[PDB]
């Protein structure tokens, strides 16, 4: 694919956010770099606004697949990188059980040589003392289901609760091209995520440090 060949390297990568959450407004800049060939990602966010209203796990899932390692055998089925440079729509609900909901509208594209992920989040329906705004959720996280001019993902995030049990998090994800070109319609598969989060010691805005890998798997 096209779109391939503009991640054989390392490629830095913007993050802008703006969010709503029950009428608390927000914005997140990150900053980091992507390497495709390992699945690497590595990112820091910083909320540009004051403290973030939402705990910042919650929001992982929402700040770039094409960045996911696919294997040489499973190359047609990336549709990811093959809607680039011109990029695509990413829209997604995420409905946290027993609590509200985030929807996401965001594209990601390349502006010269860096990869974009520009974002607005809308949540609504939350708790005031549940385990989003009441920040009850631990600072750390715990396959992503693909399917076919675009595609169609599903998966469920298991936010741990510090109370030892854990707050869900279904979500349901499309993505279209934004530009004309031929894209790459995939076959069911999955990805395999991890994610490390972190803290910059010498950080004093609110932020987060995260370290992912994540390889495309099931076929």
């Given at each position: 694919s096209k779109g391939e060949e503009l991640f054989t390297g390392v490629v830095p990568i913007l993050v802008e956010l703006d969010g709503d959450v029950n009428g608390h407004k927000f914005s997140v800049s990150g900053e980091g770099e992507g390497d495709a060939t390992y699945g690497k990602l590595t990112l820091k966010f910083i909320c540009t606004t004051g403290k973030?209203?939402?705990?910042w796990p919650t929001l992982v899932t929402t700040f770039?697949?094409?960045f996911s390692r696919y294997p040489d055998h499973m190359?047609?089925?990336?549709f990811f990188k093959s809607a680039m440079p011109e990029g695509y729509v990413q829209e997604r609900t995420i409905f946290f059980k027993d609590d509200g909901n985030y929807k996401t509208r965001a594209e990601v594209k390349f502006e010269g040589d860096t990869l974009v992920n520009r974002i607005e989040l809308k949540g609504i329906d939350?708790?005031?003392?549940?385990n989003i705004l009441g920040h009850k959720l631990e600072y750390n996280y715990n396959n992503v289901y693909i399917m076919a001019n675009g595609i169609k993902v599903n998966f469920k995030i298991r936010h741990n609760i510090e109370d030892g049990s854990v707050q869900l998090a279904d979500h349901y994800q499309q993505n279209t091209p934004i530009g004309d070109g031929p894209v790459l319609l995939p076959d069911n598969h999955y990805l395999s995520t991890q994610s490390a989060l972190s803290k910059?010691?010498?950080?004093?805005?609110?932020h987060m440090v995260l370290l992912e890998f994540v390889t495309a798997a099931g076929i």
């Open positions: 973030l209203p939402v705990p770039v697949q094409c190359k047609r089925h990336d939350f708790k005031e003392d549940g910059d010691p010498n950080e004093k805005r609110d």
